[PDB]
Write a protein that holds these residues in place. Structure first.
Motif, PDB file in Angstrom:
ATOM      1  N   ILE A  93      22.910  37.356  42.737  1.00  0.00           N
ATOM      2  CA  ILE A  93      23.880  37.639  43.755  1.00  0.00           C
ATOM      3  C   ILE A  93      25.089  38.353  43.111  1.00  0.00           C
ATOM      4  N   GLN A  94      25.717  39.176  43.925  1.00  0.00           N
ATOM      5  CA  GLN A  94      26.950  39.869  43.608  1.00  0.00           C
ATOM      6  C   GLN A  94      28.064  39.170  44.334  1.00  0.00           C
ATOM      7  N   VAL A  95      29.056  38.687  43.590  1.00  0.00           N
ATOM      8  CA  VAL A  95      30.119  37.857  44.149  1.00  0.00           C
ATOM      9  C   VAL A  95      31.451  38.593  43.889  1.00  0.00           C
ATOM     10  N   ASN A  96      32.137  39.003  44.958  1.00  0.00           N
ATOM     11  CA  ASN A  96      33.465  39.611  44.827  1.00  0.00           C
ATOM     12  C   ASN A  96      34.515  38.568  44.522  1.00  0.00           C
ATOM     13  N   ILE A  97      35.675  39.006  44.033  1.00  0.00           N
ATOM     14  CA  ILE A  97      36.691  38.052  43.672  1.00  0.00           C
ATOM     15  C   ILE A  97      37.183  37.213  44.865  1.00  0.00           C
ATOM     16  N   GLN A  98      37.359  37.845  46.020  1.00  0.00           N
ATOM     17  CA  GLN A  98      37.762  37.071  47.243  1.00  0.00           C
ATOM     18  C   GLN A  98      36.801  35.945  47.592  1.00  0.00           C
ATOM     19  N   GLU A  99      35.499  36.226  47.635  1.00  0.00           N
ATOM     20  CA  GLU A  99      34.506  35.281  47.988  1.00  0.00           C
ATOM     21  C   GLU A  99      34.410  34.152  46.929  1.00  0.00           C
ATOM     22  N   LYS A 150      34.917  42.080  32.685  1.00  0.00           N
ATOM     23  CA  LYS A 150      35.901  42.650  31.727  1.00  0.00           C
ATOM     24  C   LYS A 150      36.540  43.976  32.201  1.00  0.00           C
ATOM     25  N   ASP A 151      35.679  44.792  32.833  1.00  0.00           N
ATOM     26  CA  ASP A 151      35.965  46.118  33.415  1.00  0.00           C
ATOM     27  C   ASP A 151      36.763  46.132  34.743  1.00  0.00           C
ATOM     28  N   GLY A 152      37.039  44.965  35.302  1.00  0.00           N
ATOM     29  CA  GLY A 152      37.765  44.881  36.554  1.00  0.00           C
ATOM     30  C   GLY A 152      37.076  45.622  37.688  1.00  0.00           C
TER      31      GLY A 152
END
Ligand SMILES: O=C(O)/C(=C/c1c[nH]c2cc(Br)ccc12)SS/C(=C\c1c[nH]c2cc(Br)ccc12)C(=O)O
Ligand SMILES: O=C(O)/C(=C/c1c[nH]c2cc(Br)ccc12)SS/C(=C\c1c[nH]c2cc(Br)ccc12)C(=O)O
Ligand SMILES: [Ca+2]
Ligand SMILES: [Ca+2]
Ligand SMILES: [Ca+2]
Ligand SMILES: [Ca+2]
Ligand SMILES: [Ca+2]
Ligand SMILES: [Ca+2]
Ligand SMILES: [Ca+2]
Ligand SMILES: [Ca+2]
Lengths: 173, 173
Positions: A159-165, B153-155
């Motif tokens: 899964i790809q998890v964004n910082i908000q989620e 690391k890459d933001g």
């Protein structure tokens, strides 16, 4: 039948705002385990119960509506049966060697590394886990598998998890 | 000098295994907070201290070694100073309207949605957050930011994980 007893249970627990707060849930879980001398516990604490409510509170009302509460309560009812079945020495607790069997019976097949991490986070210095810690762990574990599953739409196992989620999923728990 | 004192106090607190357990941490935080009545609290409970230790236990010993402890302690010391500063009505508690100044002064900039969630998880029915809850929240929020950033690391603002990784990351009471 059971549908009417349960609806009554929820109505009376939820009370005036028709949702189950952390404190309501805490008081009922303590009422019930008090009757099961085979479940050893230092009690359901408020902090644990606020964690349980937040993780189950998928509409962000702050409290547990009928379906949210039903889901939780039915899990605990199955999980207490498992705990008793796997407390094969009647310590009232689940030790390190009992834990895999118990979690596997609940549908969670983890590996040695993960079992060791959970014992490390949830069990005491002797590696024993009491009943509120066991339930607290399973609620979250069950939630975390469910969260992964929602995010894994294509069934790739990643899964790809964004910082908000990430922040929502870890901080509202 | 302060350095020598800090090392003595840690040695005394950690005792025979030279690491600080959740129970040891609970005791010292309860002993110190009682000397600061402006930091209103219902106490640090064992579940909240097990979580703190867990999120700070980066070498997975199950307890806090000297550097792990020092790092938690220095954050707590900064954060208590912020709590006193942003508690402008002197209630001993952090209200909803005081919270964002405090979080901004701790370096965190969260959207309104995430505040609402944090307020529901950690503050009372009046929107007031007490000291142990404020610290529990901040230790967790910091640890979660640090965890995510380590993996990005890459933001890109995103991480990719499998189920094992997700469980290692999230299975924190
Ligand atoms: O099927 C059900 O909904 C059941 C609910 C239930 C059992 N005892 C209760 C007491 C009160 Br005051 C309200 C509701 C009650 S009976 S299943 C059972 C054990 C069981 C079920 N949930 C539990 C929670 C906890 Br904490 C401890 C034990 C639980 C049994 O048959 O022993
Ligand atoms: O005022 C005090 O009680 C202080 C105690 C203290 C100083 N260094 C310590 C080391 C250990 Br292992 C225990 C106690 C120590 S000095 S003020 C301080 C941090 C601080 C201030 N308020 C706090 C509340 C809580 Br809960 C924890 C820490 C607090 C400091 O010098 O670091
Ligand atoms: Ca209610
Ligand atoms: Ca809800
Ligand atoms: Ca046992
Ligand atoms: Ca317990
Ligand atoms: Ca120790
Ligand atoms: Ca450690
Ligand atoms: Ca205030
Ligand atoms: Ca509190």
């Amino acid at each position: 039948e059971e549908v009417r007893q349960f609806r009554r249970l929820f109505a009376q627990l939820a009370g005036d705002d028709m949702e189950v707060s952390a404190t309501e849930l805490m008081n009922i879980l303590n009422k019930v385990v008090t009757r099961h001398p085979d479940l050893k516990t230092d009690g359901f604490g408020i902090d644990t119960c606020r964690s349980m409510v937040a993780v189950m509170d998928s509409d962000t009302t702050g409290k547990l509506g009928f379906e949210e509460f039903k889901y939780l309560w039915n899990n605990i009812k199955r999980w207490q049966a498992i705990y008793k079945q796997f407390d094969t020495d009647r310590s009232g607790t689940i030790c390190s060697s009992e834990l895999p069997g118990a979690f596997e019976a609940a549908g969670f097949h983890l590996n040695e590394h993960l079992y060791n991490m959970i014992i490390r986070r949830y069990s005491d210095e002797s590696g024993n886990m009491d009943f509120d810690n066991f339930i607290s762990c399973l609620v979250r574990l069950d939630a975390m598998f469910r969260a992964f599953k929602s995010l894994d739409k294509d069934g790739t196992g990643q899964i790809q998890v964004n910082i908000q989620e990430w922040l929502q999923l870890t901080m509202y728990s």
